[PDB]
Design a protein around this ligand. Sequence first.
Ligand SMILES: [Zn+2]
Ligand SMILES: [Zn+2]
Ligand SMILES: [Zn+2]
Lengths: 38, 54, 380, 154, 604
Amino acid sequence: GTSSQAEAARILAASWPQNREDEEKQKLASHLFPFEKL
Amino acid sequence: DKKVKELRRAVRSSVWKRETIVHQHEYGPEENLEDDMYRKTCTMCGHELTYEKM
Amino acid sequence: TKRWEGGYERTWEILKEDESGSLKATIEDILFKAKRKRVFEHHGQVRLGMMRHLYVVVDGSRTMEDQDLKPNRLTCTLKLLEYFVEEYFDQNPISQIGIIVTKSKRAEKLTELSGNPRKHITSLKKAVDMTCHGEPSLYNSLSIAMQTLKHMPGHTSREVLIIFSSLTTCDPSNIYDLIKTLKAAKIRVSVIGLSAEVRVCTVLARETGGTYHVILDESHYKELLTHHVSPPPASSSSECSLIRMGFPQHTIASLSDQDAKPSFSMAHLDGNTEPGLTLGGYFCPQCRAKYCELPVECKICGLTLVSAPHLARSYHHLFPLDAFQEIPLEEYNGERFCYGCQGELKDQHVYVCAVCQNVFCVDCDVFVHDSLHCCPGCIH
Amino acid sequence: SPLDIYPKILDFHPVTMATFTMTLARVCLCPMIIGRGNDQVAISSKFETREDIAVIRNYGNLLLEMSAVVPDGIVAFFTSYQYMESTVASWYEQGILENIQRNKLLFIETQDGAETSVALEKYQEACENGRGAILLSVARGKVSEGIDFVHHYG
Amino acid sequence: KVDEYGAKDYRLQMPLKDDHTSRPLWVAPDGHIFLEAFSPVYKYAQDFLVAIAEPVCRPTHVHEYKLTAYSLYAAVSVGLQTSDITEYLRKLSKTGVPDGIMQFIKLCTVSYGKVKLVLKHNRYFVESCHPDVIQHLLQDPVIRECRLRNSEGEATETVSFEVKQEMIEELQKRCIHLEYPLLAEYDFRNDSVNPDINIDLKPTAVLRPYQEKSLRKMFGNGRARSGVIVLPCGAGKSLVGVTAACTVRKRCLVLGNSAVSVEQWKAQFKMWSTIDDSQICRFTSDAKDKPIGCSVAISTYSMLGHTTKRSWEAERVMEWLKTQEWGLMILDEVHTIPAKMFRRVLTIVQAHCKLGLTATLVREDDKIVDLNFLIGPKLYEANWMELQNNGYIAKVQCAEVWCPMSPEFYREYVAIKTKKRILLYTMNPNKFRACQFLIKFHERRNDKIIVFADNVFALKEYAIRLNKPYIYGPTSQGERMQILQNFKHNPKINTIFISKVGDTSFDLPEANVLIQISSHGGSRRQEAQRLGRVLRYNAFFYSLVSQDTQEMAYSTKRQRFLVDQGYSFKVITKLAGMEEEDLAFSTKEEQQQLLQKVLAATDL
DNA sequence: AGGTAGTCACAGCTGATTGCGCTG
DNA sequence: AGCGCAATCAGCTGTGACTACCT
Ligand SMILES: [Zn+2]
Ligand SMILES: [Zn+2]
Ligand SMILES: [Zn+2]
C-alpha cells in the first residue's frame, strides 16, 4: 500500500536514535565507512 | 517415528492465527462522584478511568 | 644450525647508565639516529633517459568482454592506460605515444604518434564505448608500428607495448619473419598478457629485448604499467642527436594595451563547436601560430613547442649535490649558526659543505639534499 | 601406480613397493575430474549413452570454452576412432564446431602414418605461433605414446 | 590501599624521581606494567616486557602488561637471570620499583630449575639437582600414588624417581601449588636414542621477523621447551609449526580439531618442509595411509581419547603410536585443550616438547590458567596492531551497527522469556534490511562476503529470501567443499552464509567483508575467530545486533578481547541510502506476517 | 534468599549399517 | 544380482548460556 510504505519507513528509519540526533542537528572521511561516504 | 514427527506439526502450527490478546477497555456506565468527577470502570479488566467533565 | 636455535637476542642491552640518568642522552642519540633514513635521492635509479616513440596496442576482441577485471577487461585496461599515459608524459618530456586497436583480424590506428596527452586521453574515453568483436591480429599491429617507426631517427628508442587479452592471434603471413625484421630494425616490443602465457609473445619479447608479463590482478596490472613508465638507460654518446624545438611564451592579450589581438587556436579550429578565440595563449616563435595546450608540435611549421620548466625539472639529476661532510659540533671551531635557517647549532653533528665551507644543521642538510638540490651558499 | 598387480600379472617377487612424487617450487600440474555439465547431466562416455545428444553437446561445450582459456595447444584423447568420428560428426552437424575452429585449429589424427605425421607437423607449427591448435586422437593409438608434449606443446 | 576516590593510590609507595620523563614505564605494587608507546625506546621496552610479562591490552598509546608467576618462569627459562631482569626493570621505571615486586620476582624466579621432568625409554622420571626438595615433596600424599612398587629410590649418579604415566597431570597440578614448577626441556641436539629424521625445510620459505622472535624464544639456549605461541589466522601460524618441526628434527605429531585440518597440515608440510609422502601419514580413519612406521604423523582430537570401542585398524595404530617417544607434538587450536576428553590426550601419548598454536587464547570457565601446567607458559603473544601496521595483516575496520526492534516484534520479545526470545531479535526485520543493504552495497563493489549466522533456523529463511548459497553444516562433505571452491574463483557469486562451521581454522579463501548475525552468547573466542577469517582499510567486518535486547549486552561483552587487541568498534546507527533503494519487508503486512512464522517454532 | 547440575541449540568426530552403481 | 564405494544413522563430546529446586 501507498500509506503502508510511508508508515513503515517512518517507524523503522527514525525509531530510537533519530528523534534526538536530528533534533540536535536542527539546533546545531578516514573513519567513515564506504557506504557512509556515498 | 522421526518421519511422522517431522510432518505431524505441519498442520498443528497452521491452526492458530492470533497470538496477541486484544486489550480494548470496554467501560460501562459512568459513576458521578463529588466535584463533578466522573469515573468509568472497565468490565474486562477492572480498569478505573476517573475524569472531570466540563 | 639455525639462527633462532642459538641464543635469544637481548635488544635492551644497548642502553646503559654511568651517572644514573644518561638515558636522556641515549634517547637523544636515538632521536638523532631516527633522521637520515634516505639516501639523499628521491629516485636513486636511472638519472637520465632518451626520446621514446612508444606505440600502445590494445586488444579489441571478444575476450575483452570478460569480467576478470571489474567491470570488464576493456574498461579497466583503458582506465589504467589513461593513468599510464599521464604518468609517462609526466616522466618523459619529449616522448610520443601512439595507440593502435586491433579488431577482427585487422589493426586500426586509433591515434597518431604525438606528444599531446589530452588527445590520447580523449581517444581512450571515446574508445571506452567500442564494440569488442572478432580476434586480434598481432601481425597487423606490429606491421603498422614498424611502418611508422622505420623512418624515425636512430637515436630515439623505438618501443612497442602490446596489451594482449585474447590468447589467439590471426596472422595473414608468417610472424617470425616479422619478428626478425623488428629485431633488425631495433624496435623493442613489450607484451602484457591478461589470461595466460602465450608462446609467440614470449618469443617476441625475448628476441626484441622486451619483457613479457601476465596479469595477476588489477594491482599487478598497474604495477607493470608503472614499470613500463620508467625510461630505459641511455648510452653515453651515440651521434649528433639534437632537435629543433621552440619555447612559446604564454603571451596573453590585455585590452589595456593597444596590441590586444584576438586569435583562434589551431588546435580548437578542428573542433565541431566554435573554436576558442581567446585574447592570447602560446604563440609559435617561428610562424606566430597560436596554440592553447603544451607540449604540442606546431601544425604549420613542424616546430616542437615544449615548456622550459618541464625540461628544467630534470636538470638536478645531471648535477647532483655532493653529500656534506659530517662534523661533530665540538670539532668545528667556527660559527654556531646554521647558514640556511639561522638557527642555533645544538645537535651533536654539524654538516659543512665541501665548496663554500658553510654550516648547515641536520634539517637543512636533509632539505637541501632531498628537495632544494642546491647549496644556498654555493649560489652566492 | 598399482605395484600389487604387476607381481601377479607376471611371475615376480618384488621387495620394494616404492613410488616417488616430484616436488617443485610450485605445483606444475592441475589434474581434475569433470563430471556433470552445465545442465547437471553426467558426461560419462557410457556405451548406452554414446549416442546421447546431451552428452555430446556437453563434450563439445567443454572443448569449446576450454579452448578459450588454455593457450597454444590442447591434446584430446578419445576412447576409439569410431566414437571420435561420431562425436566430431555431431559437432559439425551443430553450430558448435565452428566456435571451436575460431578459437583453435582442429587437427584429426587418423590411421595413415604420413597423414598423422603431417598433421603433427602442422599442429606443431600452429602451436609455435599464437594461432593455437587442437590435436584430436585416440588413447590407444600410435600417436599417444609416439610423441611427448613438451612445454608450450599441449 | 586508600579509597578517597575509589582508586588504588600508590603515590607514596614509589616516589623515586631521578629523571622526569626519561623512562617510559610504570610499575604497580601488587603487579602491573604500564608502557608508553610514544617513546624513542619503545621497541627495546617491548622486547624486554614480552620476554618477562604477558600483555593484557595493547591500545595505540599506552600499552599495559601484567606480571605473573608463569611469565617469570618463562623469562628465567631464557638465559635472563634475576639480576638482569631486576636491574632492567629498575632501569625503566620512572617511579621506582615497589618492594612488593622485587620479593615476588625473587620468589618466582628462584625456584625454577630445582625440579625437572624427563622422558626416557618410554618411562617418566622426575629429576632434581637438589636432593632436599625430593624429601620436601616426599610428605605430600598425592605424589605417593604416582610412585609404583614402593619407589625404592632409583639411585643414580642427583636424585630421581619414577612417576605414573597416566597421573602426570595431577603431579604437574600439585607442583605449582608446592612452589616447585616443573619444566619440560628437550635437548634434541644430543639424544642418540631417538631416530632423528631427515626433514629439512626448503630454502625458499621466508618468514617475517615476528615469527623469528617467537621461534628464537622457543629455543632459548639450544633446547626446545613446551610453550604456547599465539598468532592471528591471517598471519603465519602453520609456517611456525612447520619450521619448529624441521628444527627439532625428530618424530613429529600434529593434532587438529577437525578432520579437514589434517589435510591443511599435510599441505603445509608438503609446501614448506620437503618431506616425501611415504613418511607423511594422516590418521583420521578416512584413507588409512599406513600410519605405522612414519616420520611425521598428522591426526585429530576426539580420536585419541575415545571412551568407547575402537576400530581394529585404529586400535592397532593406537597401540603402535603409544609405544614410542615423540619429538615436538604440535597441538593446533590449543584454546580448546582444557576439555574433559582433550586433557587426557596429552597424558595418553608420550612426547618431549608440546607446542601449542592458536589465534584466540581466550576461553570461558577460566580454564586457560590450567593450560599453563597442561602444556607450558605463554611463550609468544603477537601484537596485532603493529602486525597490521606492517601491512602483512589486513587493517579491518570493525563496525558494531545496531538495528531497532520493530514494534510488532518487541511486544513478543518482552512478552516471552523462556528461551523463546532468541528468534525474535535474530529475525528482526530492520536487521534483515540492514544485512541485505550491506550485502548489495559490497557486491556492487566486488567484495567477497562471509555471513556468519548461528541459530540455523533463522539462517534458513535468511538465505533463501536473498537466494544465496548457505552452509547448513550437516549438509555433506562434498557440497561444502564445492561451494567454498566456487566462492572464490567466480565473479557471479561472491557471498556465502556459514552457520557455526567457520568458527574454527579452515581453508576459507581470502575475504574482505564479514557480517555476523546472532552469534553465541559471550564467546570472545568466536568473535576473534570470525575476525580472523577476514584479516590475511583493506577489509571491514560488521556485527549486527538488535537494540533493547540481550544481543546488545552480548556484543558489548564479546568485543572486550578485540579492544584489548587494539580494535575499535565504531557504532553505526543509520545506514546511508537505506530508503534510496528497495529492500525486503518494505511494508508492515509482511513484517507482521513474519511474526506468525517466527512464533511457529513452538519446540515444546 | 542463593548456587550447581540438567538441558537445549549447534557443531565436531568416529564407529558401524545399507543402498545405489558396476567395463566396448 | 554378488562386490564395492559412498551416503547415512548412533553414540559420545565441546561451547555457550538458560533454568528448576531447596538448606
Ligand atoms: Zn609554427
Ligand atoms: Zn638549518
Ligand atoms: Zn655549498
